[PDB]
């Protein structure tokens, strides 16, 4: 089995980056206000990424 030739990635690197972005000032307040009249909305974070 040639599995020892495989690389080493970081599975949740992208998700952890979004977690760190969510800790910035006003990010949670932005999400809370966006989810006021609906259960599902698109929010643009401080780093320019739009996340459902």
């Amino acid at each position: 089995f040639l599995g020892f030739l495989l690389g080493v990635g970081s599975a949740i690197a992208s998700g952890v980056a979004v977690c760190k972005v969510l800790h910035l000032e006003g990010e949670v307040n932005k999400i809370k206000s966006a989810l006021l009249s609906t259960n599902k909305a698109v929010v643009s974070l401080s780093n320019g990424v739009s996340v459902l």
Binding site: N39, A41, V42
Partner: protein
């Protein structure tokens, strides 16, 4: 195509409760949280509240907590609002609205037809009609004054006419006595003042009734 159909117009005495309906077509109640907005005549819109059926939750603004109740009925695909402790500043047009995409957040995409709610001070009560007199003398305009409205702006036609011949949709503004009153003007070349009879219709208040008035100097 998602659309909202509201209930008919309502007139209620002060201090009572009004309940307005909104039925959704082309979409599920769980797919479309319903926002309730209102505007008084002449004024801007005012955000009242909203309901998220899929979470079974609802909210109202601070100005409406304790008086506004939002409920949902999934089997009939309907949303109801109920406002209590009515006041003269609660007579307005009420809208239910939604959105078609999560990018709008609270930019309202689809709207209901609207429902007019009249916070009254009386009940069905008829108007009064009074003609004009020669004022001074090109053309000449004469009118038929009306007073003491109540059961919503009204329309009635008998011995009336065809297209043009002027437009008659005059304001019908209220008074300090809680009773509206409108005017009307029909203008014609002054010569026909000497030979033509002016029989003007007048709005009557309930819906099915009429007043006519002939103007003779």
């Amino acid at each position: 195509q998602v659309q909202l159909v509201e209930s008919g117009a309502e007139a209620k005495k002060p201090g009572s409760s009004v309940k307005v309906s909104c039925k959704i077509s082309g979409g599920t109640l769980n797919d479309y949280p319903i926002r309730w907005v209102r505007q008084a005549p002449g004024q801007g819109l005012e955000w009242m509240g909203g309901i998220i059926p899929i979470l079974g939750t609802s909210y109202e603004t601070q100005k409406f907590q304790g008086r506004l109740t939002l409920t949902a009925d999934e089997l009939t695909s309907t949303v109801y609002m109920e406002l209590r402790y009515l006041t003269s500043e609660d007579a307005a047009v009420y809208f239910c609205a939604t959105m078609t995409s999560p990018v709008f957040i609270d930019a309202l995409d689809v709207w209901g037809q609207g429902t007019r709610v009249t916070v009254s001070s009386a009940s069905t009560k008829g108007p009064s009609v009074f003609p004009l007199a020669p004022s001074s003398k090109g053309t000449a305009a004469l009118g038929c004054l009306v007073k003491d409205y109540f059961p919503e702006p009204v329309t009635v036609s008998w011995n009336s006419g065809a297209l043009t011949s002027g437009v008659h949709t005059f304001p019908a503004v209220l008074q300090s006595s809680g009773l509206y009153s409108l005017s009307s003007v029909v203008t014609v070349p002054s010569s026909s003042l000497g030979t033509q009879t002016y029989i003007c219709n007048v709005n009557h208040k309930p819906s099915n009734t009429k007043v006519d008035k002939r103007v003779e100097p």
